[PDB]
Design a protein around this ligand. Sequence first.
Ligand SMILES: *[C@@H]1O[C@H](CO)[C@@H](O)[C@H](O[C@@H]2O[C@H](CO)[C@@H](O[C@@H]3O[C@H](CO[C@H]4O[C@H](CO)[C@@H](O)[C@H](O)[C@@H]4O)[C@@H](O)[C@H](O[C@H]4O[C@H](CO)[C@@H](O)[C@H](O)[C@@H]4O)[C@@H]3O)[C@H](O)[C@H]2NC(C)=O)[C@H]1NC(C)=O
Ligand SMILES: *[C@@H]1O[C@H](CO)[C@@H](O[C@@H]2O[C@H](CO)[C@@H](O[C@@H]3O[C@H](CO[C@H]4O[C@H](CO)[C@@H](O)[C@H](O)[C@@H]4O)[C@@H](O)[C@H](O[C@H]4O[C@H](CO)[C@@H](O)[C@H](O)[C@@H]4O)[C@@H]3O)[C@H](O)[C@H]2NC(C)=O)[C@H](O)[C@H]1NC(C)=O
Ligand SMILES: *[C@@H]1O[C@H](CO)[C@@H](O[C@@H]2O[C@H](CO)[C@@H](O[C@@H]3O[C@H](CO[C@H]4O[C@H](CO)[C@@H](O)[C@H](O)[C@@H]4O)[C@@H](O)[C@H](O[C@H]4O[C@H](CO)[C@@H](O)[C@H](O)[C@@H]4O)[C@@H]3O)[C@H](O)[C@H]2NC(C)=O)[C@H](O)[C@H]1NC(C)=O
Ligand SMILES: *[C@@H]1O[C@H](CO)[C@@H](O)[C@H](O[C@@H]2O[C@H](CO)[C@@H](O)[C@H](O)[C@H]2NC(C)=O)[C@H]1NC(C)=O
Ligand SMILES: *[C@@H]1O[C@H](CO)[C@@H](O[C@@H]2O[C@H](CO)[C@@H](O)[C@H](O)[C@H]2NC(C)=O)[C@H](O)[C@H]1NC(C)=O
Ligand SMILES: *[C@@H]1O[C@H](CO)[C@@H](O[C@@H]2O[C@H](CO)[C@@H](O)[C@H](O)[C@H]2NC(C)=O)[C@H](O)[C@H]1NC(C)=O
Ligand SMILES: *[C@@H]1O[C@H](CO)[C@@H](O)[C@H](O)[C@H]1NC(C)=O
Ligand SMILES: *[C@@H]1O[C@H](CO)[C@@H](O)[C@H](O)[C@H]1NC(C)=O
Ligand SMILES: *[C@@H]1O[C@H](CO)[C@@H](O)[C@H](O)[C@H]1NC(C)=O
Ligand SMILES: *[C@@H]1O[C@H](CO)[C@@H](O)[C@H](O)[C@H]1NC(C)=O
Ligand SMILES: *[C@@H]1O[C@H](CO)[C@@H](O)[C@H](O)[C@H]1NC(C)=O
Ligand SMILES: [Ca+2]
Ligand SMILES: [Ca+2]
Ligand code: NI
Ligand code: NI
Lengths: 424, 988, 5, 5, 5, 6
Amino acid sequence: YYTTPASRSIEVLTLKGDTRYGKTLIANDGTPLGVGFPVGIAVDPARGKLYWSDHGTDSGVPAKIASANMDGTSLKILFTGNLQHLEVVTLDIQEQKLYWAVTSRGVIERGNVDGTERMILVHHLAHPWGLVVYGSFLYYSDEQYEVIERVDKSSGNNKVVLRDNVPYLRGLRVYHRRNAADSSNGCSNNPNACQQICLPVPGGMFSCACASGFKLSPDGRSCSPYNSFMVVSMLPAVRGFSLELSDHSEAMVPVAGQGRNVLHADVDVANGFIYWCDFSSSVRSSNGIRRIKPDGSNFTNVVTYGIGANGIRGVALDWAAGNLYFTNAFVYETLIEVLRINTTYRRVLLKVSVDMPRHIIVDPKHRYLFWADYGQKPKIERSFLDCTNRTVLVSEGIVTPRGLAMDHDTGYIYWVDDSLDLIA
Amino acid sequence: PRGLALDPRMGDNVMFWSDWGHHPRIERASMDGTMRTVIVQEKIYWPCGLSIDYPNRLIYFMDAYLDYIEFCDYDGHNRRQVIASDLVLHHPHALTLFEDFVYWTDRGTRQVMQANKWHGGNQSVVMYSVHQPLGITAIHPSRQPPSRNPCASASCSHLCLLSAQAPRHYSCACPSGWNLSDDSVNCVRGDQPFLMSVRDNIIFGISLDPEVKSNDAMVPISGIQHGYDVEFDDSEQFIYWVENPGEIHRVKTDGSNRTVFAPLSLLGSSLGLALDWVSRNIYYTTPASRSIEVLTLKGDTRYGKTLIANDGTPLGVGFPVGIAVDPARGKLYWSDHGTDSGVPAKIASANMDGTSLKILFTGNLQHLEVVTLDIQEQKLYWAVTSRGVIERGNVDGTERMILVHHLAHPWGLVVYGSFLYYSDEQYEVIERVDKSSGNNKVVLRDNVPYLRGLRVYHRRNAADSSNGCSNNPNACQQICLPVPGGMFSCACASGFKLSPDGRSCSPYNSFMVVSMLPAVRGFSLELSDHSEAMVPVAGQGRNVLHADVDVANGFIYWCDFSSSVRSSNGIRRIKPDGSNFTNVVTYGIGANGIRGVALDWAAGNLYFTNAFVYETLIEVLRINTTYRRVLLKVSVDMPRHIIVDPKHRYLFWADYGQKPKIERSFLDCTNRTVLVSEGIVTPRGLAMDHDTGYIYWVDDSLDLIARIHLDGGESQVVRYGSRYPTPYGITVFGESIIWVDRNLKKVFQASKQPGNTDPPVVIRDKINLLRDVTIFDEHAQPLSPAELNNNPCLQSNGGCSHFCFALPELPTPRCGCAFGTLGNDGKSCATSQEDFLIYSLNNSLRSLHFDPRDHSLPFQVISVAGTAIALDYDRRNNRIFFTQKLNSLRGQISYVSLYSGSSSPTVLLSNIGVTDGIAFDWINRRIYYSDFSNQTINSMAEDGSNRAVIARVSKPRAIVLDPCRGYMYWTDWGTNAKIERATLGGNF
Amino acid sequence: XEEXX
Amino acid sequence: XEEXX
Amino acid sequence: XXNXX
Amino acid sequence: XXLXXX
Ligand SMILES: *[C@@H]1O[C@H](CO)[C@@H](O)[C@H](O[C@@H]2O[C@H](CO)[C@@H](O[C@@H]3O[C@H](CO[C@H]4O[C@H](CO)[C@@H](O)[C@H](O)[C@@H]4O)[C@@H](O)[C@H](O[C@H]4O[C@H](CO)[C@@H](O)[C@H](O)[C@@H]4O)[C@@H]3O)[C@H](O)[C@H]2NC(C)=O)[C@H]1NC(C)=O
Ligand SMILES: *[C@@H]1O[C@H](CO)[C@@H](O[C@@H]2O[C@H](CO)[C@@H](O[C@@H]3O[C@H](CO[C@H]4O[C@H](CO)[C@@H](O)[C@H](O)[C@@H]4O)[C@@H](O)[C@H](O[C@H]4O[C@H](CO)[C@@H](O)[C@H](O)[C@@H]4O)[C@@H]3O)[C@H](O)[C@H]2NC(C)=O)[C@H](O)[C@H]1NC(C)=O
Ligand SMILES: *[C@@H]1O[C@H](CO)[C@@H](O[C@@H]2O[C@H](CO)[C@@H](O[C@@H]3O[C@H](CO[C@H]4O[C@H](CO)[C@@H](O)[C@H](O)[C@@H]4O)[C@@H](O)[C@H](O[C@H]4O[C@H](CO)[C@@H](O)[C@H](O)[C@@H]4O)[C@@H]3O)[C@H](O)[C@H]2NC(C)=O)[C@H](O)[C@H]1NC(C)=O
Ligand SMILES: *[C@@H]1O[C@H](CO)[C@@H](O)[C@H](O[C@@H]2O[C@H](CO)[C@@H](O)[C@H](O)[C@H]2NC(C)=O)[C@H]1NC(C)=O
Ligand SMILES: *[C@@H]1O[C@H](CO)[C@@H](O[C@@H]2O[C@H](CO)[C@@H](O)[C@H](O)[C@H]2NC(C)=O)[C@H](O)[C@H]1NC(C)=O
Ligand SMILES: *[C@@H]1O[C@H](CO)[C@@H](O[C@@H]2O[C@H](CO)[C@@H](O)[C@H](O)[C@H]2NC(C)=O)[C@H](O)[C@H]1NC(C)=O
Ligand SMILES: *[C@@H]1O[C@H](CO)[C@@H](O)[C@H](O)[C@H]1NC(C)=O
Ligand SMILES: *[C@@H]1O[C@H](CO)[C@@H](O)[C@H](O)[C@H]1NC(C)=O
Ligand SMILES: *[C@@H]1O[C@H](CO)[C@@H](O)[C@H](O)[C@H]1NC(C)=O
Ligand SMILES: *[C@@H]1O[C@H](CO)[C@@H](O)[C@H](O)[C@H]1NC(C)=O
Ligand SMILES: *[C@@H]1O[C@H](CO)[C@@H](O)[C@H](O)[C@H]1NC(C)=O
Ligand SMILES: [Ca+2]
Ligand SMILES: [Ca+2]
Ligand code: NI
Ligand code: NI
């Protein structure tokens, strides 16, 4: 188990078989019960409990010590309060007590796993970066004192210095003979039960889990690709989330890495492809349209030639005819182009200098094409699928519309307007 | 809005402007702005550069996107194109007219062009510019046609604007913040309040009426670097705000008298502002130095005092954010972020004199914001970004409750009247809400980026809120501070202490000197006093390693260091109140800078250590004199921190080199004994108590603070353990030791006696890059012979000429000689009269003994013009002949007498050139020199006459001669380099 | 250009 | 070769 | 380098 | 060139 503050999630990775499977367990949702900024993590395999120390988020999660099942299905807040600048959390599995370091108060605290009996063990510390409990002693490292010290686990008395004048001290752990037979759980009692990931839960049971981009089949043992998820696109990456809010797993292998400056994204459900457009104002290679499977395979550059200085500004796939409408923007003029998927055919359907279509959507059900303009004459414009018989749907009360959506069941056009702060 | 044109002729009185926002258009209006009309709104994308053809009454306009130049009548009906579908236009900006030509500037081609105004023909380039030409105008009387002025008979009080209205053709107006009176000719100042909303780079004045969107309650304050807070004084109509370098700026509401008012702090940039309008003082926070300080506004000369500082206690300043003051009640309030192992995040209160610190509210307060005060209701309001709420509480610390919630990032907060105003940096909104339970939400502004703090400008009567300082003007010499109960406590600026009168100020005479890499600072030895006991030595070029003091003369000596800039290395001195900044030692500083400074107050001798790459020197400089002498020169050892003690007449220094030790020696660095050599690795600082004679030193490698008696013997441990990681400097005052710790960023104080276990008490906390500590007190530097064991150097330097060195058990001092040899009387100095060595160094002549162990200079450095190159000595007259090289083309031969007697160099021959060799014939009294520029060896008489040529060689150098055998030798370093021999006449 | 980050 | 900052 | 002064 | 002057 490992925490990634950059993605603000707690993830699990298997190291049993030949193929590595990874999954996100708890993610930063709106509620305080989620993950704000995970620092440390401790596990109790015999009881299926997971503990982590969390900083707060503004108006969201408070700085706290939290507990959850190792499959992440039961969040809980154990201790909150004077926990500014929390350090890593370590668990004494024998006595079932948690130990934390609070840098702001310079203390090491202790508390039970059920959220009771919080109390201060060691005082007058400077920066207790790491700590670990083994046997009857507690070992901690202080980054500013540059010391590694051993104290009793029941009280900060009987202090003993192990090392001193050592710079850049960090977390600590004790390599010892942890036995996989004295502590057992559902996953150990039932090997090779789940296809990809087995995660123990309290009560000696176990719950199967699947890698990112996969979800449990109704049999409870197998994995299948995600069928219904949202595709959220940002500049550094493209990520997918389940449409039912209880599941924090990444419903899609995140498209990220070097060269990603994703502006917009679109999906091809039947063929199982996600299309996105990269944009770079400096590098001409990082401009174009690319596609990938939701599971991370079969990467392909779709459009790479003829992109203007302002780059591709919108992509909309016609899933019925296999046409990919996109908007190619230049310094003083804008193009609307069609590319037929798995063909070399490509043509321009409209060139406009005064207008500037930016975000485009297509509706094969009604055979219409809609784009949003935020130039000197902001408007929402509709045309046929060949961009030939144009009309203006909204022309007043609209400034910088940078998003469109179609209902497909009520026939309404939804758009977001960030200059007037409304959704209409 | 970009374009602008005018037609002030009596008939028209109209103004034209162009806007290139969404829905671009060109508008016409009357000169008073009444009859607004859009004339052209079709076939325009980027309008710019309007200009009016007065005889034809046409308005010329330009588009940088569609790339055309057009004109139309005043209604826009008869549009024509003069330049269209033409590739000359790339990005035209401005336009002007004259006769039958139009001149425009192009930002794409960066050139000014000319064309016919009717059809665009005869295009030509007027001039090419390396930069983009923005504005253009044609100055001629034809461009300003005369007309009748209807405002001549007008009686408008402030502004008479022309108008297109027929009956009068003028209209009265008045500036921002004024009312048009019912008589419609006079204007009166509007006394209504308005809200100042400071942004990242600008401060705006907006009305409290949410339906008014003009943002013109006052002239905006542009040019703000990093705006966080703003402050006002309703009387005198001044607005105040801070700036990055540590200054406060001031401007009136009408936009005039913008100026830099006073410098705030030398240690960093201020964050918050609070103004006492009754006593005329302003309180501000300095998060860099973690202190709250006050500046005086009343008088002509500014006075500043640090009220509250970070002393490590919970009742103190951790990281102050915003201040609110109650002048009538005498209380000051501030919101504080916490510090690690120190002050918590809290809302705290204090009297406006810095006393009676109190903690009001603590708890869920992460990412605190500015606090504000409702003086009438006596309640505090603050924002908590980490929870997105606005909270309210009584000033006594009770009834804390949440008022507004579900905010994103509150940044501004002010409560006036019956409403609460807050600016949310996210949501980009300024919003008003009732102070009673936070209902009836109203939006004033939205879509405004970079929102910051808020404040309401309103008229405050100091007469209805008088306090002690207003009831007693001129009671305090420098600063008056109100105190609860109607009392007042006088105060003094930083560096001064209050006299026993309680009304007068005197300079500090007992304080500690703390030196850090960024600055040198002073703190009073009375721990309750958070004021700065010295004007901080901070600024560009400051990199301080050690500091020393001269209590009797009132000076602080410190040594700067830099491994990149050579000129920023040396020894400087300054008065504790500023005043006489001075450079003490600047020449000859080694590659490593000055590593220690020791001042002998009895003799006036300054001991310092300069370190070269593979050696180090210990040197004495006598204060206020040019006498400098090297005492000890070592390579295997490296003295770093040196202390002097006139009472026992000893020198001590730490080494921490490859063989760490603490050494002891006389005042002339002789009789070097080793005190401690075992159990020592990195001693970084020495100290002494004059009344007990114990050497106190610190060692961060062993985390040790230990002491040893001046006579040697056992080393006693004073402080030991992992809780003292990096003790860098130490001093002893009274019964306590005071040391600085770099890792803990604290100045500690603890008992000097070994074996004590009481925890040290923190003087100051969170100070970066601590280097040393030093006590500035009379008791630390006594001068009476009774306690200095009758030091002979007290009585007029002990009668010595250059240096006075007293010996521990002798009644007479050993006089030291900076240059020359000590005389027979044992006190005077004269020229060596021995065999020694001389050489040239740039523009000077320097001497050197043959003994490497002798550091005395045979004679003082002789300064010359140009660059001395070659030397030779005449025994008979005790003169040295030397060449000077000037401007690489000319040279001189000059001599200076070694008899001294105020002798100065004088020239024997000029206009030679580069001359790199001299040899004097002691028999025939002729000077032989090698003219390199003219490529010959020449010989002249001793008086400089009858010069003759010896021979012509390619590149001569290094002439030697032997008159007893009539041969001269020289070296030619040109092609086929060789050593040539010729007779003194140049033959053979 | 709008978003090049 | 010794201190700075 | 250069064999100057 | 951007038509904004700043
Ligand atoms: C354009 O070129 C790109 C270049 O790569 C092509 O990707 C794309 O061609 C292909 O488009 C077809 C559309 O049908 C895709 O086939 C479908 O794949 C589905 C996923 O298959 C996976 O999972 C199933 C689970 O049962 C498994 O059996 C497969 O072995 C595989 O692991 C699949 O579910 C779907 O099946 C439906 O249709 C079948 C038709 O024979 C039926 O038999 C079946 O019962 C079901 O109704 C279908 O096979 C294909 O993935 C895709 N190519 C690739 C490599 O992904 C080209 N098309 C365009 C225009 O995008
Ligand atoms: C210069 O021009 C401006 C614009 O006309 C004038 O500003 C107005 O002046 C009046 C009188 O000073 C202000 O009226 C006061 O409003 C207070 C509450 O303000 C809120 O509600 C008003 C609407 O009622 C809003 O406009 C405002 O934005 C706020 O939302 C009241 O509390 C005041 O009442 C007090 O005085 C009255 C009369 O004595 C008492 O009966 C009350 O008990 C109380 O003491 C008062 O009604 C008005 O708010 C101002 N508007 C603006 C723009 O702020 C200046 O008056 C004018 N100056 C000159 C010299 O001509
Ligand atoms: C190298 O050269 C520098 C100058 O460049 C010398 O620095 C001077 O040192 C003298 C030391 O005496 C300083 O003079 C002293 O100033 C004290 C403060 O004066 C203020 O306060 C008094 C009392 O209110 C006022 O009268 C006065 O106007 C000032 O406002 C005085 O308290 C001292 O007085 C004592 O000594 C004098 C004789 O000097 C007696 O007449 C008095 O009775 C009393 O005993 C004294 O006047 C002077 O200020 C320094 N000047 C500068 C520019 O800093 C260094 O001393 C010198 N180096 C060495 C090592 O000598
Ligand atoms: C070295 O000698 C040259 C020639 O005599 C002399 O110019 C330098 O002294 C100073 O140099 C400065 C930089 O050019 C100049 O500003 C200053 O006027 C000059 N002083 C005199 C007397 O002319 C000498 N420099 C050094 C480093 O010793
Ligand atoms: C300015 O431009 C006009 C054309 O707009 C020039 O007038 C023409 O000049 C040529 C050469 O002499 C004649 O053959 C034509 O008959 C003229 N008329 C036109 C309308 O073409 C004029 O010479 C130019 N003047 C200058 C000084 O540049
Ligand atoms: C604000 O600036 C103005 C203009 O400098 C000052 O007004 C006059 O300034 C001139 C030149 O200094 C003086 O000779 C006049 O005596 C000033 N007249 C008045 C009425 O003051 C004004 O003094 C400045 N005000 C402040 C407080 O800064
Ligand atoms: C897609 O990826 C799979 C797995 O790497 C590979 O076997 C298949 O050949 C790829 N298909 C294409 C069209 O490249
Ligand atoms: C499409 O444009 C044609 C003219 O070419 C017009 O007659 C018709 O009304 C338009 N159709 C729709 C659906 O608006
Ligand atoms: C020191 O500064 C004071 C005040 O500026 C000045 O009067 C005095 O002449 C200065 N003395 C010296 C020697 O620099
Ligand atoms: C000091 O040095 C002198 C000369 O070497 C020597 O005679 C004497 O014993 C030494 N010790 C003292 C402190 O006099
Ligand atoms: C050397 O050469 C020229 C020519 O003989 C002579 O006039 C000059 O004075 C000499 N030195 C210089 C300055 O070149
Ligand atoms: Ca253009
Ligand atoms: Ca250490
Ligand atoms: Ni930490
Ligand atoms: Ni903030």
